[PDB]
Design an enzyme around this catalytic site. Structure first.
Site, PDB file in Angstrom:
ATOM      1  N   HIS A  19     142.840  33.223 -11.491  1.00  0.00           N
ATOM      2  CA  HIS A  19     144.823  33.870 -10.651  1.00  0.00           C
ATOM      3  C   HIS A  19     143.365  33.621  -9.207  1.00  0.00           C
ATOM      4  O   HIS A  19     143.813  33.383  -8.247  1.00  0.00           O
ATOM      5  CB  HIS A  19     145.536  34.930 -10.843  1.00  0.00           C
ATOM      6  CG  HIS A  19     146.252  35.124 -12.081  1.00  0.00           C
ATOM      7  ND1 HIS A  19     145.565  35.366 -13.395  1.00  0.00           N
ATOM      8  CD2 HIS A  19     147.208  34.574 -12.128  1.00  0.00           C
ATOM      9  CE1 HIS A  19     146.291  35.495 -14.104  1.00  0.00           C
ATOM     10  NE2 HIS A  19     147.668  35.064 -13.674  1.00  0.00           N
ATOM     11  N   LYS A  43     160.751  43.792 -19.953  1.00  0.00           N
ATOM     12  CA  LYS A  43     159.442  43.338 -20.361  1.00  0.00           C
ATOM     13  C   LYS A  43     158.805  43.365 -20.556  1.00  0.00           C
ATOM     14  O   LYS A  43     157.481  42.869 -20.977  1.00  0.00           O
ATOM     15  CB  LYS A  43     160.072  41.243 -19.229  1.00  0.00           C
ATOM     16  CG  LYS A  43     158.632  41.188 -19.621  1.00  0.00           C
ATOM     17  CD  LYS A  43     158.689  39.243 -19.269  1.00  0.00           C
ATOM     18  CE  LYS A  43     159.741  38.887 -17.817  1.00  0.00           C
ATOM     19  NZ  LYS A  43     158.269  38.306 -16.882  1.00  0.00           N
ATOM     20  N   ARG A  92     148.404  25.189 -17.356  1.00  0.00           N
ATOM     21  CA  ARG A  92     147.230  25.124 -17.873  1.00  0.00           C
ATOM     22  C   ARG A  92     146.853  24.004 -19.052  1.00  0.00           C
ATOM     23  O   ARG A  92     146.365  23.427 -19.213  1.00  0.00           O
ATOM     24  CB  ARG A  92     146.602  26.724 -17.992  1.00  0.00           C
ATOM     25  CG  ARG A  92     145.922  27.813 -17.554  1.00  0.00           C
ATOM     26  CD  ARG A  92     145.384  28.667 -18.255  1.00  0.00           C
ATOM     27  NE  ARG A  92     146.308  29.520 -19.745  1.00  0.00           N
ATOM     28  CZ  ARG A  92     146.552  29.075 -20.769  1.00  0.00           C
ATOM     29  NH1 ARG A  92     145.640  28.669 -21.160  1.00  0.00           N
ATOM     30  NH2 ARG A  92     148.218  29.627 -21.386  1.00  0.00           N
ATOM     31  N   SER A 130     146.021  35.859 -18.774  1.00  0.00           N
ATOM     32  CA  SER A 130     146.451  37.410 -19.098  1.00  0.00           C
ATOM     33  C   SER A 130     146.295  37.588 -20.888  1.00  0.00           C
ATOM     34  O   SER A 130     145.142  38.775 -21.080  1.00  0.00           O
ATOM     35  CB  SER A 130     147.289  38.099 -18.407  1.00  0.00           C
ATOM     36  OG  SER A 130     147.097  37.451 -17.348  1.00  0.00           O
TER      37      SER A 130
HETATM   38  C1  LIG Z   1     157.531  32.711 -14.202  1.00  0.00           C
HETATM   39  C2  LIG Z   1     157.235  34.082 -14.411  1.00  0.00           C
HETATM   40  C3  LIG Z   1     157.742  34.478 -15.931  1.00  0.00           C
HETATM   41  C4  LIG Z   1     155.642  34.942 -14.184  1.00  0.00           C
HETATM   42  O1  LIG Z   1     155.143  34.247 -15.080  1.00  0.00           O
HETATM   43  P1  LIG Z   1     153.851  34.621 -15.701  1.00  0.00           P
HETATM   44  O2  LIG Z   1     154.315  35.068 -17.022  1.00  0.00           O
HETATM   45  O3  LIG Z   1     152.999  33.202 -16.474  1.00  0.00           O
HETATM   46  O4  LIG Z   1     152.596  35.194 -14.919  1.00  0.00           O
HETATM   47  P2  LIG Z   1     150.683  35.185 -15.255  1.00  0.00           P
HETATM   48  O5  LIG Z   1     150.469  36.183 -13.674  1.00  0.00           O
HETATM   49  O6  LIG Z   1     150.440  35.060 -15.858  1.00  0.00           O
HETATM   50  O7  LIG Z   1     150.594  33.686 -14.591  1.00  0.00           O
HETATM   51  C5  LIG Z   1     151.235  33.608 -13.421  1.00  0.00           C
HETATM   52  C6  LIG Z   1     150.835  31.941 -12.937  1.00  0.00           C
HETATM   53  O8  LIG Z   1     149.704  31.527 -13.187  1.00  0.00           O
HETATM   54  C7  LIG Z   1     148.927  29.995 -13.976  1.00  0.00           C
HETATM   55  N1  LIG Z   1     147.470  30.650 -14.617  1.00  0.00           N
HETATM   56  C8  LIG Z   1     147.253  32.466 -15.265  1.00  0.00           C
HETATM   57  N2  LIG Z   1     146.529  31.868 -15.982  1.00  0.00           N
HETATM   58  C9  LIG Z   1     145.486  30.974 -14.949  1.00  0.00           C
HETATM   59  C10 LIG Z   1     144.104  30.814 -14.829  1.00  0.00           C
HETATM   60  N3  LIG Z   1     143.085  30.742 -15.574  1.00  0.00           N
HETATM   61  N4  LIG Z   1     144.061  29.619 -14.179  1.00  0.00           N
HETATM   62  C11 LIG Z   1     144.935  28.289 -13.691  1.00  0.00           C
HETATM   63  N5  LIG Z   1     146.020  28.827 -13.751  1.00  0.00           N
HETATM   64  C12 LIG Z   1     146.371  29.899 -14.139  1.00  0.00           C
HETATM   65  C13 LIG Z   1     150.565  30.330 -14.615  1.00  0.00           C
HETATM   66  O9  LIG Z   1     150.475  29.299 -15.714  1.00  0.00           O
HETATM   67  C14 LIG Z   1     150.911  31.410 -13.900  1.00  0.00           C
HETATM   68  O10 LIG Z   1     152.236  29.937 -13.986  1.00  0.00           O
HETATM   69  C15 LIG Z   1     157.976  35.347 -12.885  1.00  0.00           C
HETATM   70  O11 LIG Z   1     157.864  33.904 -12.262  1.00  0.00           O
HETATM   71  C16 LIG Z   1     159.739  35.753 -13.148  1.00  0.00           C
HETATM   72  O12 LIG Z   1     159.833  35.815 -14.120  1.00  0.00           O
HETATM   73  N6  LIG Z   1     160.706  34.810 -12.014  1.00  0.00           N
HETATM   74  C17 LIG Z   1     161.109  35.460 -12.107  1.00  0.00           C
HETATM   75  C18 LIG Z   1     162.725  35.606 -12.642  1.00  0.00           C
HETATM   76  C19 LIG Z   1     163.525  34.245 -12.546  1.00  0.00           C
HETATM   77  O13 LIG Z   1     164.142  34.121 -11.621  1.00  0.00           O
HETATM   78  N7  LIG Z   1     163.458  34.140 -13.838  1.00  0.00           N
HETATM   79  C20 LIG Z   1     164.524  32.486 -14.634  1.00  0.00           C
HETATM   80  C21 LIG Z   1     165.053  31.853 -13.360  1.00  0.00           C
HETATM   81  S1  LIG Z   1     163.368  31.259 -12.277  1.00  0.00           S
HETATM   82 CL   LIG Z   2     151.790  37.123 -19.463  1.00  0.00          CL
HETATM   83 MG   LIG Z   3     147.924  33.914 -17.384  1.00  0.00          MG
END
Ligand SMILES: CC(C)(COP(=O)(O)OP(=O)(O)OC[C@H]1O[C@@H](n2cnc3c(N)ncnc32)[C@H](O)[C@@H]1O)[C@@H](O)C(=O)NCCC(=O)NCCS
Ligand SMILES: [Cl-]
Ligand SMILES: [Mg+2]
Length: 163
Positions: A19, A43, A92, A130
């Site tokens: 991140h 969640k 990813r 994560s």
């Molecule tokens: C998409 C949701 C679930 C959150 O995402 P997530 O659970 O993936 O969180 P996480 O913190 O692990 O990652 C954040 C983002 O960065 C990316 N990422 C994570 N780790 C890495 C890495 N090592 N390298 C590159 N990218 C990464 C992920 O692919 C992700 O897209 C969140 O935006 C959401 O629920 N939004 C609101 C609800 C909503 O409106 N839902 C339905 C209609 S959209």
């Molecule tokens: Cl997660």
């Molecule tokens: Mg992640």
């Protein structure tokens, strides 16, 4: 000529070096980056909103153009509230790519002003999620290489309240 504001939403549970890379990269291409932490009421994260924001701030605060904010609700309503230029996501894997194409298309139907840009990680961070990090910490493995020191310490301070 106006001024660009990109939102980076996620659960950041916890933030990883992955991140960090993405935010840093994004901070070079846009005027303001907002690290937006999904509270996730129904969640169930490991770290609270407060831990999650704090570890984020500890890790990226040294970047002048990065803000940090918790949110819930519909990402598109947040998008509008924040008067954002675009949403940033990382891609990813192939499952990520497919989910995100769907979501972007759906959100464009809910708000035609919506936009999504995507970065792919450097190869050094491609295997970090994560979830995987939680699991390794949970089994008393060493996550130092994949996350900031603050996060290491935070894992030790749950192993201290037991876990
Ligand atoms: C998409 C949701 C679930 C959150 O995402 P997530 O659970 O993936 O969180 P996480 O913190 O692990 O990652 C954040 C983002 O960065 C990316 N990422 C994570 N780790 C890495 C890495 N090592 N390298 C590159 N990218 C990464 C992920 O692919 C992700 O897209 C969140 O935006 C959401 O629920 N939004 C609101 C609800 C909503 O409106 N839902 C339905 C209609 S959209
Ligand atoms: Cl997660
Ligand atoms: Mg992640």
């Amino acid at each position: 000529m106006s001024k660009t504001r990109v939102i980076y939403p996620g659960t950041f549970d916890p933030i990883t070096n992955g991140h960090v890379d993405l935010v840093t990269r994004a901070s070079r291409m846009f005027d303001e980056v907002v690290v937006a932490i999904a509270i996730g009421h129904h969640k169930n994260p490991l770290f609270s909103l407060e831990e999650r924001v704090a570890l984020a701030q500890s890790s990226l605060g040294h970047l002048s153009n990065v803000e940090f904010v918790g949110f819930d609700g519909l990402l598109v309503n947040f998008f509008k509230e924040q008067k954002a230029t675009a949403v940033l996501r990382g891609l990813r894997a192939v499952s990520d790519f497919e989910y995100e194409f769907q979501l972007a298309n759906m959100n464009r139907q809910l708000d035609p002003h919506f936009e999504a840009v995507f970065l792919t990680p450097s190869e050094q961070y491609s295997f970090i999620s994560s979830t995987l990090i939680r699991e390794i910490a949970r089994l008393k493995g060493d996550v130092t290489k994949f996350v900031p020191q603050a996060v290491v310490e935070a894992f030790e301070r749950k192993h201290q309240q037991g876990w």
